[PDB]
Amino acid sequence: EATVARLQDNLLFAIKGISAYLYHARELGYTDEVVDAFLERGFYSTLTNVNFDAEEFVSLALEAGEMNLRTMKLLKKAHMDTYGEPEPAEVRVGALDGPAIIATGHSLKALEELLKQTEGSGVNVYTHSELLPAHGYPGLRKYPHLAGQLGGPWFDQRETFSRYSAAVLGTSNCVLLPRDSYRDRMFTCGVARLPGVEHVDGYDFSPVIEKALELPPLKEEDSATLTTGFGLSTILSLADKIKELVEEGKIRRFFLVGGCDSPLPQAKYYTEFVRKLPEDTVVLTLACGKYRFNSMDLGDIDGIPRLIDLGQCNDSIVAVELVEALSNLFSMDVNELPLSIVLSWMEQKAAAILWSLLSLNLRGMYIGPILPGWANDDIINVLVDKYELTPIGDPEEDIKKMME
Amino acid sequence: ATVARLQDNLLFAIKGISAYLYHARELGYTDEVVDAFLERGFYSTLTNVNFDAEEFVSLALEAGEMNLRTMKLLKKAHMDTYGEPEPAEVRVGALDGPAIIATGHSLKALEELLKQTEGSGVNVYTHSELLPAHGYPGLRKYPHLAGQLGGPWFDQRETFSRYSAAVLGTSNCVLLPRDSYRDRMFTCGVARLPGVEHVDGYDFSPVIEKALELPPLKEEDSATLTTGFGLSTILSLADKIKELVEEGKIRRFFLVGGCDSPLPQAKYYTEFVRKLPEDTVVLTLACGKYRFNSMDLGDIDGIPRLIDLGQCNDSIVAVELVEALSNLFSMDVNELPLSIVLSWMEQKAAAILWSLLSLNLRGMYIGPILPGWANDDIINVLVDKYELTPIGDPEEDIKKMMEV
């Protein structure tokens, strides 16, 4: 039927995300055999004339969410064991004088190697989109020529890359066909590829550095700031203040807003939402959706930041950790916390994280811009009604329903 | 459009590789580099990672290489657990008494079923790609493995209908039951059908119970088939074939086989071998062999005109056999007297075709014609560089294949 095809394609999307995280984990030298065996099994379950059962495909998607939790935890372990655990970090958004390299994507091993290969050369390495969290890691902020942030979300890149006479390095996910304005100024490594752009051999970034030096330098602009790298230790070392502040009702609610973004007009929702959120709530944010609002002056709530940047998409594992630290902190069940979840969700890119969240039986979440919601019975009707997954609507009404 | 089609083709190759890897892990054999390639390949098919078609072709060739590797590892597993396949005569027809018909590919489920059915009084029959099982010494040794019953996979609704026996689908190429036999079929491993029981692990007790609660089978007219031509058997006959091809009494090796379908165009493969001259030998693989593996081809000085290399994943022995033939004739691989006629489905057997292409075998003839194939960019692109030839008329194609 149609639903069997839709369900196997969704499982394949989850397997893709898990494989992304697994690839980056292997690049840092961490490998889990059980997740690889699940990749084999799950992908194999989608060959023609093997499995015709929709409910078994839902079971497989939930097992995929579990495996995604496993590999996200493994990748977090890799990142912390190589670069330290991320601590809060304010980051400059604007050009500094000099030659420059803009690195975009997810991988921190490529950024590590580039930063190692750019010492003393006098080129500034800027982060973009999901390389912003790198600024919070001790073993990465230590390089002083990691200048700051430049640009915002991934889908702005053709704009950003256009207006900065800097070398361009797409390390991983969410890369986009270059304008010929900067095509000959762009490079890729790892798995990312663009036709007509040079691909770095291994981690030998001489071609980019050379290019960065053949280019007119950047000129310093008026900048702005961002905050990122809120690692778990920082958050649950603040547990006393959060306890005291939510017991007196001076912090009413935690909202978890974030996820993979897109230039969809409906995604403007996430800018309005946090804008209308009452000033006595705190927002936990991750992945690219953060650029919908992470530049707003939200303020402080008794010295606790109203915006808390947990990092990149694969840092979902810290959020799920925090809630189990929060529940045990309040002696509450997981669904008794003053927590609402508003996802920004792409079907292709972040199916794995949604299925991980459903594996934990989290009820009443709000889903991404458009609803890929598989129209037919078993999926949308039965699965939504069981997990009470909710499509986003109007910001004010959604906030009213979430506060109650 | 070509990028999407190439991502789909790479994913099909990954499907085949993951199938073979799953069965190999089921027997306890794991190759880390094929799993790392699985990760990389999956990740390279995210929406905004790789936009380069030539790199997707390179990925498909790397997939062919990895498929050769995993087919080799699965052959190693099968041989280390069940022995090396020796030629085997196979009974095609029902013996009176309770019966279980097993279909699919992997022999571990069949091994456990045969282990669990000694003394119980049920006859175990093979179907489709479990026909090669009859050749493994450590598996044919069970005397209640009666023989074969039916032919290709698409015979099942026919076969399963007309034999009141239990039905066990261990693996690929199963399809929704007719209500005549729905309640007597079972599945294990990866296969699933809505409304059919799925065995837990390898506990086939429900199936044997059903085989004993059903009316028994009735005596057959009997027929024969031959299978299990393992490499060792063939290249112990290598001197004789050298002597016979230098004497010009056997002109050409044809390699005909692969995935079949209830497509009318697939009738080609019945006519082809029917028209083949009596001075050629046919090496056959997968289920397509049932187009002709029951024909009276005869002997060429005690060398069988039809030689059944086994099941799809046994392509690896053919790839070895030719490499033994070259060194035997002091010939390079593409001047040997060998023609190759694939029966090929893009979904099911992309991996073996890409393996054959990784080995730079030039001028093969490809599977059945699907009306839409003419415009399909993949056939065009494969043809232009590797001179793959679409099948046309059997007689004309053999004429063009012989006089070279």
Numbering used by the authors:
A (entry chain A): 88 to 491
B (entry chain B): 89 to 492
What's written in the study?
The crystal structure of Mm HCP C67Y was determined at 3.0 Å resolution. This variant exhibited a homodimeric architecture identical to that of Mm HCP wild-type (WT), demonstrating the rigidity of the dimeric architecture. However, no electron density maps of rubredoxin and the [4Fe-4S] cluster-binding domains of Mm HCP C67Y were observed. This indicates that these regions were disordered, which could have been caused by the lack of the Cys ligand at position 67 in the [4Fe-4S] cluster. In Mm HCP C67Y, Glu434 was positioned at the solvent-exposed area, far from the hybrid cluster, although Glu434 of WT is a ligand of the hybrid cluster. Superimposing Mm HCP WT and C67Y showed that the regions around Glu434 and Trp461 were shifted by ~5.3–5.8 Å. Owing to the denaturation, the loop region around Glu434 became unstabilized and shifted to the solvent area, which may have been favourable because the hydrophilic residues, including Glu434, may compensate for the positions where the [4Fe-4S] cluster-binding domain of WT was occupied, resulting in the stabilisation of this area via networks of polar interactions with solvent waters. Mm HCP C67S and C67Y were less active than WT, as they exhibited lower kcat and higher KM values than WT. Considering similar spectral features of Mm HCP C67S and C67Y variants and the structure of Mm HCP C67Y, the lower activity was caused by the fact that Mm HCP C67S and C67Y variants had neither [4Fe-4S] cluster nor Glu-coordination to the hybrid cluster.
Hybrid cluster proteins (HCPs) are unique Fe-S-O-type metallocluster (hybrid cluster)-containing enzymes. They play key roles in nitrogen metabolism, stress responses and protein S-nitrosylation in microorganisms under anaerobic conditions. Hybrid cluster proteins (HCPs) are Fe-S-O cluster-containing metalloenzymes in three distinct classes (class I and II: monomer, III: homodimer), all of which structurally related to homodimeric Ni, Fe-carbon monoxide dehydrogenases (CODHs). Here we show X-ray crystal structure of class III HCP from Methanothermobacter marburgensis (Mm HCP), demonstrating its homodimeric architecture structurally resembles those of CODHs.
